[PDB]
Amino acid sequence: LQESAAALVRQLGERVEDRRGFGFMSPAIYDTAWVSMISKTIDDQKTWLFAECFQYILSHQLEDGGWAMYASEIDAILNTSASLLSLKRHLSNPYQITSITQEDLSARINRAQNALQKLLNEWNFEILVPALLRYLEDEGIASGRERLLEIEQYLYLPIKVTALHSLEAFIGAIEFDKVSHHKVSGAFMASPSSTAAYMMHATQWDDECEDYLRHVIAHASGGVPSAFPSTIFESVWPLSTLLKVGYDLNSFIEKIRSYLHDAYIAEKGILGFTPFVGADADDTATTILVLNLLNQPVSVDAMLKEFEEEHHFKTYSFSANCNVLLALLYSQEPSLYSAQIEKAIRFLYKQFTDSEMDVRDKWNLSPYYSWMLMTQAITRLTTLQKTSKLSDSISKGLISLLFRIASTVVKDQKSWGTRASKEETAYAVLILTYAFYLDEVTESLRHDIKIAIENGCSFLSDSEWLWVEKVTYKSEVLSEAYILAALKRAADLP
């Protein structure tokens, strides 16, 4: 149990020696579609740099002509459109890739065209779909996207933005030689698709970007992931998930905790999913929790005065708030940050009351995830209040909300999830292992909670596209972490 938990610490620890970083995100057809379009001038001859990505795109085409739907129709539309654009590009300029012809590729293009036509006729994300449609229409093939995907240059400054992850959607007008300064370890916000667009449309070829892309292709999970490296995210999300349920792994974790401490020191406490790629409230708060529960106190003020606003915590609206709440509740003196703890626990309750107990969580695609985080925070607050470590109507509402969550979850048991995913099942059973100890829960409700926990842990004992991203991705470390955390937390039940 703890050895498997330690393995996650070691897996982050073993990747510390790697200078580029670590990667646990699954490849996304969108990104490798953008990497398959890279052409390099070698010996005065233009050749496609990465034919393995082109083969990856060719091998993922479905019978209908489209690509994988993953978790949302936007995923299918994006993968199909990017892959079909790549097919058009390689039809126009086959160069040195003789695997595909000018007729088989034309047949593939027609199939993908009809598939995307069907998808658009069924469709009623924001900047990736219209951009892909424009790119496809510039190379043949005729409300749609232009009913909601029209809400909306700011990349020449050294300040990093989230558009460095989706730069491939701005090929129409962008000075990539100007964005070349936005290069860390040869990357562009760790997004292979953005670096692929850069290398395609850079005036001056950068061998460093080619080396980074080769590292990604040969060290990811030809298909490239959405973000690479993903060191801090894939290192601290498992550790925090294991630590919050009380996994004891302090004593190969040394190389992971030391690297995380170094990342905290260099990044001034605010950490993204990788070094020098940004900072999200969830990521930094989770890393702070990991350091605090790994016998190394770090002041939460580093993220507190970066990701705190009125009545809620920002993210650069639920997952960040609850992760910050959990980080605060596990600090050295949770009574000192009582104001922000109350702020978060009130904001989440208000959101639940205003959303009919149905709310999502930015990073994940399962409401079970939000219910799990809320149950964790509520039960930690209750335990602190009972033990007097942390000091009326709001509390009664919180207890009633936890009871309603427990009852609705019990009624929502299928085994859990709408797609038979272990992550959603783990979230749903973790939303009940913290609702089992409520003193206001009746005997029948408690029995139902125990039965649902048993039936969820049976399902638990593995990665599905539940983690949002330009294209939703599945990470093995996240799934394993939540499974282990739920199993241990249920094992703590009387």
Sorted by where each starts, the structural domains of the chain and their CATH numbers stand as 29-219 (1.50.10.160), 231-491 (1.50.10.20)
Q: Are 24 and 478 in contact (CB under 8 A)?
A: yes
Report the structure determination method. cryo-EM
Any known ligand binding at 471? Answer: yes
Q: Are 124 and 73 in contact (CB under 8 A)?
A: no
Cα(167)–Cα(188) distance, rounded to whole angstroms? 9
Any known ligand binding at 216? Answer: no
Any known ligand binding at 3? Answer: no
For this entry, resolution in Å reads 2.9
Read off φ and ψ for residue 29, nearest 5 degrees: -60, -30
Any known ligand binding at 310? Answer: yes
Which residues, other chains included, contact 36 with Cβ-Cβ below 8 Å and sequence gap of 6+?
48, 50, 51, 53, 54, 56, 57, 86, 90, 222
Give the per-residue SS3 of the chain.
Answer: CHHHHHHHHHHHHHHHHCCCCCCCECECHHHHHHHCCCEEEECCEEEECCHHHHHHHHHCCCCCCCCCCCCCHHHHHHHHHHHHHHHHHHHHCCCCCCCCCCCHHHHHHHHHHHHHHHHHHCCCCCCHHHHHHHHHHECECCCCCCCCCCCCCCCCCCCCCHHHCCHHHHCCCCCHHHHCCCCECCECCCCHHHHHHHHHHCCCCCHHHHHHHHHHHHHCCCCCECCCCCHHHHHHHHHHHHHHCCCCCCCCCHHHHHHHHHHHHHCCCCCCCCCCCCCCHHHHHHHHHHHHHCCCCCCCHHHHCCCCCCCCCCCCCCHHHHHHHHHHHCCCCCCCCHHHHHHHHHHHHHHHHHCCCCCCECCECCHHHHHHHHHHHHHHHHHHHHCCCCCCHHHHHHHHHHHHHHHHHHHCCCCCCCCCCHHHHHHHHHHHHCCCCCCCCCHHHHHHHHHHHHHHHHHHCCCCCCECCCCCECEHHHHHHHHHHHHHHHHCCC
Read off φ and ψ for residue 435, nearest 5 degrees: -95, -5
Any known ligand binding at 464? Answer: no
Q: Which residue has the tokens 């009380």?
A: 246
Beta bridge partners of 361: 364
CA of 12: how far to CAs of 152, 255, 428, in Å? 38, 9, 26
Read off φ and ψ for residue 225, nearest 5 degrees: -80, 180
Cα(86)–Cα(109) distance, rounded to whole angstroms? 10
Any known ligand binding at 280? Answer: yes
**Closest by Cα among 79, 61, 95, 50 to 220:** 50
Cα(106)–Cα(102) distance, rounded to whole angstroms? 6
